[PDB]
Amino acid sequence: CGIFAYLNYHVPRTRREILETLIKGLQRLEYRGYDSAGVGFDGGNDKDWEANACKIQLIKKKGKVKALDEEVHKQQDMDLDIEFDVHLGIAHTRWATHGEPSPVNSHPQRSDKNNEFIVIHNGIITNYKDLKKFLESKGYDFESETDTETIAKLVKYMYDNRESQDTSFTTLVERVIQQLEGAFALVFKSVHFPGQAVGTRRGSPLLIGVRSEHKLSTDHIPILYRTTCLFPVEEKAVEYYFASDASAVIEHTNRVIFLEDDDVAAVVDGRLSIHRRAVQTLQMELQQIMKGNFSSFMQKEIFEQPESVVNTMRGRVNFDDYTVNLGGLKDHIKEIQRCRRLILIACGTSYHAGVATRQVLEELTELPVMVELASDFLDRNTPVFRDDVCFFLSQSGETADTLMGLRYCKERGALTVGITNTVESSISRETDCGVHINAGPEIGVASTKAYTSQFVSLVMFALMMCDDRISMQERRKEIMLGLKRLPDLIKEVLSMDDEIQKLATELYHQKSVLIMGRGYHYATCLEGALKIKEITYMHSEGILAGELKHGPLALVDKLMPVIMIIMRDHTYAKCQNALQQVVARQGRPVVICDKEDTETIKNTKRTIKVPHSVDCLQGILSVIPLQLLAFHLAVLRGYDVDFPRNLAKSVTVE
Amino acid sequence: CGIFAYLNYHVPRTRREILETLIKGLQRLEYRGYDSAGVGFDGGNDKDWEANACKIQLIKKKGKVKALDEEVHKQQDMDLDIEFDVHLGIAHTRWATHGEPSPVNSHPQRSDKNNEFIVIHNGIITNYKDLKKFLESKGYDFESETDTETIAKLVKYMYDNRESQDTSFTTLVERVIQQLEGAFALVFKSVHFPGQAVGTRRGSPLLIGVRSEHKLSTDHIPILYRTTCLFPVEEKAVEYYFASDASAVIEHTNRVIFLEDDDVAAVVDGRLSIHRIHPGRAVQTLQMELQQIMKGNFSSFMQKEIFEQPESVVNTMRGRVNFDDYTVNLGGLKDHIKEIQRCRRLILIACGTSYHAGVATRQVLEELTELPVMVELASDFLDRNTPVFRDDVCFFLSQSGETADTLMGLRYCKERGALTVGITNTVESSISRETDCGVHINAGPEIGVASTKAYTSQFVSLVMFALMMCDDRISMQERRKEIMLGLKRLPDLIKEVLSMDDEIQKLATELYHQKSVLIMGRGYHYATCLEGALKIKEITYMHSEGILAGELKHGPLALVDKLMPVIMIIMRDHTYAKCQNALQQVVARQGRPVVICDKEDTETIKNTKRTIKVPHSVDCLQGILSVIPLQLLAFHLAVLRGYDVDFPR
Ligand SMILES: CC(=O)N[C@H]1[C@@H](OP(=O)(O)OP(=O)(O)OC[C@H]2O[C@@H](n3ccc(=O)[nH]c3=O)[C@H](O)[C@@H]2O)O[C@H](CO)[C@@H](O)[C@@H]1O
Ligand SMILES: CC(=O)N[C@H]1[C@@H](OP(=O)(O)OP(=O)(O)OC[C@H]2O[C@@H](n3ccc(=O)[nH]c3=O)[C@H](O)[C@@H]2O)O[C@H](CO)[C@@H](O)[C@@H]1O
Ligand SMILES: O=C[C@H](O)[C@@H](O)[C@H](O)[C@H](O)COP(=O)(O)O
Ligand SMILES: O=C[C@H](O)[C@@H](O)[C@H](O)[C@H](O)COP(=O)(O)O
Ligand SMILES: N[C@@H](CCC(=O)O)C(=O)O
Ligand SMILES: [Mg+2]
Ligand SMILES: [Mg+2]
């Protein structure tokens, strides 16, 4: 899901300029959810804007943001020429994992038929049933099946039972959050508090971006408890930007305030305070969240892996003297080496990054390495000990299951390490240490550069662990020479784009495809099969090549598409046996192999020839063809690679 | 692939009776698969059986034993009524590796056009190229494209170049295997050693059954190097059954000797000795009956081994679970359970369905041992050179006990000093022998192509081990009671699941025309999804895939629409609510799944159209009940589609 709100204070904006900023804010957040959307703003057509704050208008529609943008426009009642000197608009794209993605279930949710209170919510209220029964007994009727509605019906209940005639908007929200359970990131708007916004969170991201041509009073808002607020000094002109993601705010400003749990932020009279701290400068650049010259974000993020790989190693690898220094681990690396086991915990593609680096981690650390799916890790109550080092791989740093695993391991005294791509995420904060893979914002739902950057990051960690072993010095040099050559070799793989598109035209009409690999390329066939599932909707399954003889080989015939990965490492001969078994079953497989593997290239009709690299790095090169293959298969089938069906990016809830 | 030989010594048999025995022996070996078969016996029609030992006849044919049996009873100039007081007949079923299936390539292979030496072989001689060249340079002409023929030619070379006139048959075979490389199970017969048999193995099973109405000289045959042998005491009558599988012996006798690598067993003057280059080979009693390898009233071995799972689960627990005082005792682990309890990690290593048996019990093992439990695919385990340590307990799950990758993982772990434990279903298999200890799951022989009873018997065996590991913990007494009471009720609950066969058949009709099916579960039923999807792959040849329910929203949920068949497993355990979310996620995307749920789950049944309702059991045993409907689904789909469930692919 995604949250965005635009508050202009004495910065005159027409009703058209405000709605465009709300839609433009959702378009930046659409990748977090695109099953429905909605906006909230003041209605009325009075030339005097002050006589319009008492009327709230809601425009919600099922579909992507482009469906809501069309609903906002070509409306016969809303005059888009009214000028608002002060106004508050809220918007929200929704990932509907349950029920229907109808306008009634979209946000903002309202408290009554006159829209006295509207709220946009990211998360789940684990006790909305009790709140619904209670509010229903007090004479409040509901209209939707969402847990968010109990928040709107409750802020009005606190307002309808206020002791004093001038109870601040903050007070009401405080009494609400005290009755809510679970997680939530809320942005309230009420007719009784014109132009005032309240932003609180508890386990859900929420930041406030501020812009103002005038000097700001301070750069470190103090927290209050039941010379204090952030506001322009000499003048009133100021703009605020509530958002659950920094991508929607960077285009307007790079000055944001990262709230924290129970921090109730409020904007009253154009002054921002936080009840119950810093004002940071973001290092993100607008160009990082733009497609540029690519038609989709996924294709850009695939083709920019030569640069993102370099950025992951920038300032961390030194090829002149073959040294590796991860600044985020300097004050912990020595104690990590005294531990006795490594546990890698993640979901989806981030879990595949652990499968892909498990072998080199075992080799260079000589420690047991256990890779776990976070959901299953929690179901089993896996044993964890004080001398365990637990890694948590999360591009977003907010994945619920991975985050719960983190807190599970922390309670048991394990050393927790983060491999994240979001600085102010829950996982990067709550881990004792970690590495920001510095891949850059990932907009495509399917992770591409995050996987390769996680791969490289875990390799760099492995190179630090063995930097004191004489017997492994040459092995480190071999690997670090590969990392030096890796960007150019990735470019060579991307130059085969056309050749991979031709193969896509041979498979797009197929129902299934089996992707087979072993060793360093087990993760490759799992990740390739997952990417094809996600964006092409073909039934692709990754099969460990050594397991074919134990049953799955019965699926192979001349009709079943098969992709095989055969690289020049120590498993080459075993991979040749698997290929021979497939051919014996009349399979006609596409083989991803090494350029110099003349034997495989001679006896196979369709081959994808990637350049040779170090065995523990070849997985980076062998997965990119499957990233591209999934891309071209989706185009041929007429799907949108950026917005696959049935899901969105980052699973921040159950 | 299948070896069988019958040696009657002073037990008169007619040629008809001898041939019927050989054929019946091969009938017990057909289940392994083969492309040809053959028998070797004494030719000639001299009323005196002694003048016929210098003539060996071969009858080999590409096809099935039925065809071979027809060939035997169609030969002219061969009188079947001749009575042999002493005779050695050998038989073979071949799975071709070197050379196409044909009579010349079929076994027994001969040493020359007069059949001075004949041999039957299971395995591959990796250096048959060099051997064939050497023999050809010495004037020996080959006729087949098989590696086996080099063995028959080589034993004659050793005979033609023997130093003394009375060099034993053993000596010749000893000099042959010294020059052989690879894996083999061999049985030799020669006109120069009438009535004598020699058997040897290296990495291939070979055993000898013995029967006699007279007292045998010993039950432990001592070894001899280059009282002393096995034989009836006061009389000569005795029968020997060389075989590569006890299935061909058990109907005649349950007293068998299992050979080991480089043993050379010989029968000379009706007396069995074992030579190498005090230790000896035991004459043990097999707890195996013919009815365990016969279909009976079932139409296939798959159906039999699925529907007899109430009985195999009981056999797995017999003598090991005391429901009177609720204790668990695995005899095979008595002299190791206390050392196992001092180790710090469990590692389960296996392939295929045996691996799923570890996934299915990982959680309860973690719960009751409180130790880390790591479940490894054997092939990947070897590729990574997984770190193993002296205080690791490594388990090796194998129905057959001969799976190469699981066996090589065993030897890898033994090198690292780990304590090794076997969970096997084959006595005297490589994995059971070479592990420090283990448990024979006692499921009975598995004749079907796919693991059915073996999986559920491995499941139960691993649960029993977990119950031993926590038998000293006061805090877990109640949990152990709950589990053991579930093991008590488990056979009847299996019968309850099998009584829903009709409902499973209706589900097979709905999927009859389907090309894919997603099977979704989590927790205790993750393995159920993987195992069910494997059987449907292996038996029905459709693209069934197991998906961890918790991973749906991370990508795979995109496959859900109104056309993709989906089976979901939703039981009443601590993941019930999480499974319900998965169901809502699928339904919301127009998926209409079939649900395997508890018999009493009223909410799920009313909101879902087709539900397979299984009885409720303890959470760590429900995986046995939730997997059987998928076993039956695989069975019925294959039958519907005209496939032979007992035919390997
Ligand atoms: C401020 C910052 O972000 N990084 C600084 C650091 O990068 P540097 O790469 O050294 O530090 P990282 O970005 O990796 O992580 C910053 C801090 O967050 C912690 N952490 C990170 C990820 C995680 O999942 N869990 C976790 O606890 C790290 O332990 C570390 O203490 O030197 C570089 C110099 O050009 C710059 O990038 C920055 O001056
Ligand atoms: C094979 C055998 O004769 N088992 C007898 C044994 O069963 P019991 O249940 O006592 O022991 P098992 O049959 O399971 O195993 C027999 C021996 O082989 C070892 N082993 C087994 C499997 C394995 O994978 N690795 C391994 O090393 C065991 O540690 C044990 O020393 O006593 C029972 C009577 O109480 C008899 O009915 C069984 O016939
Ligand atoms: O292409 C698949 C997606 O990238 C998906 O698998 C994703 O990796 C997880 O749903 C959560 O990943 P993070 O924990 O890294 O956010
Ligand atoms: O239906 C599949 C088979 O049962 C298969 O998966 C089998 O489990 C392994 O190929 C080897 O198993 P064993 O090591 O137990 O013989
Ligand atoms: N390798 C031998 C024997 C194979 C077997 O039956 O196992 C052959 O092909 O004749
Ligand atoms: Mg931190
Ligand atoms: Mg043993």
CB contact at 8 A, A490 and A306: yes
Residue of minimum CA distance from atom 1 in ligand 5: B124
Residue type, B110: R
Provide the token pair at B300. Answer: 């296939």
Cα torsion B496, B499, B501, B504 to 10°: value is -50
Shared domain check, A340 and A267: no
Residue B562, min C-alpha distance to chain A (Å): 12
Cα of A642 to ligand 3 centre, how many Å? 14
**SS3 (DSSP) at A37:** strand
Domain tally, chain A? 3
Structure tokens at B218: 């010993």
H runs (alpha helix) in A495-617: 497-507, 522-536, 572-584, 598-603
Same domain, A274 and A367: no
Among A90, A81, A99, A96, CA closest to A21: A90
Please name the amino acid found at residue B594.
V
Mark whether B355 and B433 lie in a shared domain. yes
Helix, strand, coil: what percent of chain A each, to 5? 40, 25, 35
Contacts of A554 in chain B (CB under 8 A): 537-539, 541, 649
Residue B274 CA: distances (Å) to CA of B192, B265, B323: 20, 4, 45
Domain end point (choices A287, A320, A339): A287
Residue B1 is a catalytic residue: yes
Assess whether B385 and B329 both reside in one domain: yes
- The CA distance from A317 to the nearest CA of chain B, in Å, is 26
**DSSP 3-state of B202:** strand
Structure-block tokens of residue B335 = 């002299």
Helices (H), A44-125: 65-72
Residue A29 backbone phi and psi in degrees, to 5: -105, 5
Which residue do the tokens 């093992």 mark?
Answer: B365
Name the token pair of A307. Answer: 């640069």
A267 and A318 in a single domain? The answer is no
What lies within 8 Å, CB to CB, of A518 at 6+ separation is A544, A545, A546, A571, A574, A575, A578, B379, B380, B383
The rounded distance, in Å, linking the Cα atoms of B527 and B620 is 12
Measure the CA–CA gap between A51 and A43, rounded to whole angstroms.
Answer: 10
Spatial neighbors of B120 by CB under 8 A, at least 6 apart, are B3, B5, B40, B90, B91, B92, B107, B108, B109, B186, B187
CB contact at 8 A, A343 and A370: yes
How many angstroms separate the CA of residue B541 from the nearest CA in chain A? 5
**A512 → closest Cβ in B362, B543, B588:** B543
Alpha helices in B246-320 (DSSP H): 301-307, 309-317
Gap from CA of B287 to ligand 4 centroid (Å) = 23
Which CATH number fits the domain that encloses residue B573? 3.40.50.10490
For a mutational test of ligand 4's pocket, the pick from B302, B349, B402, B403, i.e. the residue with the most ligand atoms closer than 8 A to its C-beta, is B403
Angle between helix A522-536 and helix A348-365 axes, rounded to 10 deg: 170
Neighbours of B646 (CB within 10 A): 18
Token pair for A58: 């809601």
What is the separation of C-alpha B292 from the centre of its chain, rounded to a whole number of angstroms?
13
Breaks (C-N over 2.5 A) in chain B follow: 226, 277
A386 touches A340 (CB < 8 A): no
Beta bridge partners of A185: A201
Q: Which two tokens stand for residue B90?
A: 């050998």
Instruction: Compute, in angstroms, the gap from residue B434 CA to the centroid of ligand 7.
Output: 5
The closest-lying atom of ligand 1 relative to the alpha carbon of residue A327 is: 10
Note whether B504 and B371 are same-domain residues. no
CA B228 to chain centre: 33
State if residue A349 touches ligand 3 by the CB under 6 angstroms criterion. Answer: yes
Nearest to B352 among A99, A341, A551 (CB): A551
Task: Identify all chain A residues contacting B366, using CB atoms and an 8 Å cutoff.
Answer: 380-383
Residue of A219, A615, A640 lying closest to A443 (CA atoms)? A640
Ligand 3 nearest atom to the CA of residue A447, by list position: 4
Among all residues of A, which ones are annotated catalytic?
1
Closest CA to B551 of A434, A527, A621, A50: A527
Q: Which residues pair with A343 in a beta bridge?
A: A370, A390
Give the helix/strand (H/E) hosting A565. Answer: strand A562-566
Q: Which residue of A has its CA nearest to B522?
A: A376
**CB A435 less than 6 A from any atom of ligand 1:** yes
B12 close to ligand 2 (CB < 6 Angstrom):
no
Chain centroid to Cα A612, Å, comes to 32
- Identify any residues that bridge with B159 across adjacent strands, giving them in sequence order: none
Of the candidates A619, A624, A613, A310, which has an alpha carbon nearest to the alpha carbon of residue A496?
A: A624
Q: What's the domain range around B209? A: 2-291
Task: Centre a 10 Å sphere on the Cβ of residue A281 and count the other Cβ atoms it contains.
Answer: 10
- Domain boundary residue, one of B439, B468, B498: B498
Q: Which of B167, B286, B175, B283 has the alpha carbon at shortest distance from B229?
A: B283
**How far is the centre of ligand 1, averaged over its atoms, from the C-alpha of A427 (Å)?**
13
- The amino acid sitting at A536 is T
Nearest C-alpha to atom 2 of ligand 4 is from which residue?
Answer: B450
For residues B121 and B135, what is the distance between their CA atoms, to the nearest angstrom? Answer: 19
Task: Tell me the C-alpha distance between A606 and A499, whole Å.
Answer: 10
Q: Are A64 and A10 in contact (CB under 8 A)?
A: no
Which stretches within B290-423 are classed as H helix?
Answer: 301-307, 309-317, 337-340, 352-369, 378-383, 404-415
Resolution (A): 2.4
Residues of chain B contacting residue A97, judged by C-beta atoms under 8 Å apart: 553, 581, 584-585, 588
Structure tokens of B432?
A: 């059971």
Contacts of residue B560 in chain A, CB cutoff 8 Å?
646
The set of protein residues with a Cβ atom below 6 angstroms from ligand 5 is B 1, 94-98, 121-124, 146-148
CA dist list (Å): B309 to A498, A550, B444, B456, B496: 55, 22, 11, 8, 12
Describe the strand order of the beta sheet including B611-614 as a list of residue ranges.
Answer: B543-548, B516-521, B566-570, B594-598, B611-614
Q: Confirm if B237 and B213 have CB atoms less than 8 A apart.
A: yes
Q: How far is the CA of A109 from the centre of ligand 5 (A)?
A: 75
SS (H, E, C) A105-154: CCCCEECCCCCCEEEEECCCECCHHHHHHHHHHCCCCCCCCCCCHHHHHH
The 8-class DSSP code of residue A232 comes to B
- Fill in the amino acid letter for B548: L
Could you give the CA distance from residue B544 to residue A551 in angstroms, rounded to a whole number?
Answer: 12
CA angle in degrees (0–180, nearest 5) for A377-A378-A383: 65
Q: Report the run of H or E that residue A317 belongs to, with start and end.
A: strand A317-318
CA distances from B242 to A642, B7, B10, B209, B429 (A): 67, 8, 17, 6, 17
Q: Count CB atoms within 10 A of the CB of residue B97.
A: 12
Identify whether residues A478 and A515 lie together within a single domain.
no
Final residue in a domain of this structure, among A243, A268, A287 = A287
Among A514, A526, A574, CA closest to A546: A574
Which phi and psi (to 5°) does residue B458 adopt? -65, -45
Asked if B568 and B579 count as a contact pair (C-beta separation under 8 A), the reply is: yes
Closest C-alpha among A121, A217, A236, A251 to residue A173:
A121
Write out the two tokens for A379. 């179901």
Torsions phi, psi for B349 (to 5 deg): -125, 130
Classify residue B616 by its DSSP letter: P
Q: What is the Cα–Cα distance from A103 to A120, expressed in whole angstroms?
A: 13
Helices (H), B120-222: 128-137, 149-160, 169-177
Are A281 and A301 in the same domain?
A: no
Sorted by sequence, the CB contacts under 8 Å of residue B602 that are 6+ apart come out as: none
Q: Is the domain of B318 the same as that of B184?
A: no
The answer to whether the CB of A395 falls within 8 A of the CB of A350 is yes
CB contact under 8 A, B377 and A541: no
Locate the chain A residue with the closest alpha carbon to B564.
A539
Q: The domain spanning residue B192 has which CATH number?
A: 3.60.20.10
Place of tokens 């049985």: B187
Ligand 1 atom closest to the Cα of residue A394 is: 24
Q: Which two tokens stand for residue A555?
A: 């699926």
CA pair distance B232, B216, nearest whole angstrom: 4
User: Which phi and psi angles does A544 have, rounded to 5°?
Assistant: -60, 125
- C-alpha triplet A16, A17, A22: angle, nearest 5°: 95
Determine if ligand 4 sits within 6 Å of the CB of residue A226.
no
In the block, tokens 């960077």 appear at A250
Q: How far apart are CA B165 and CA B179, in angstroms?
A: 22
Which of A270, A197, A155 minimizes the C-alpha distance to A3?
A: A197
Distance, CA of B365 to CA of B445 (rounded, Å): 27
- Do B267 and B231 belong together in one domain? yes
> Do B581 and A654 count as a contact with CB atoms less than 8 A apart?
yes
Decide if A539 and B556 are in contact by the 8 Å CB cutoff.
no
Same domain, A132 and A57: yes
C-alpha distances in Å from residue A195, one per residue of A239, B402, B554: 12, 77, 39
Residue B611 assigned as binding residue: no
- Name all contacts of A422-428 with Cβ < 8 Å and 24+ positions apart: A422/A395, A422/A396, A422/A397, A422/A398, A424/A205, A424/A207, A424/A258, A425/A205, A425/A394, A425/A396, A425/A397, A425/A398, A426/A203, A426/A397, A426/A398, A427/A392, A427/A394, A427/A397, A427/A398, A427/A399, A427/A402, A427/A403, A428/A397
Cβ partners under 8 Å of residue B279, min gap 6: B222, B223
Distance to chain B for A194, nearest Cα, Å:
38
Q: Give how far Cα B463 sits from Cα of B80, B364, B482, Å.
A: 55, 7, 12
Q: How far is CA A422 from the centre of its chain?
A: 8
Residue whose CA lies nearest to ligand 1 atom number 30: A328
Residue with tokens 């204790």: B327
Whether residue A214 sits in one domain with residue A95: yes
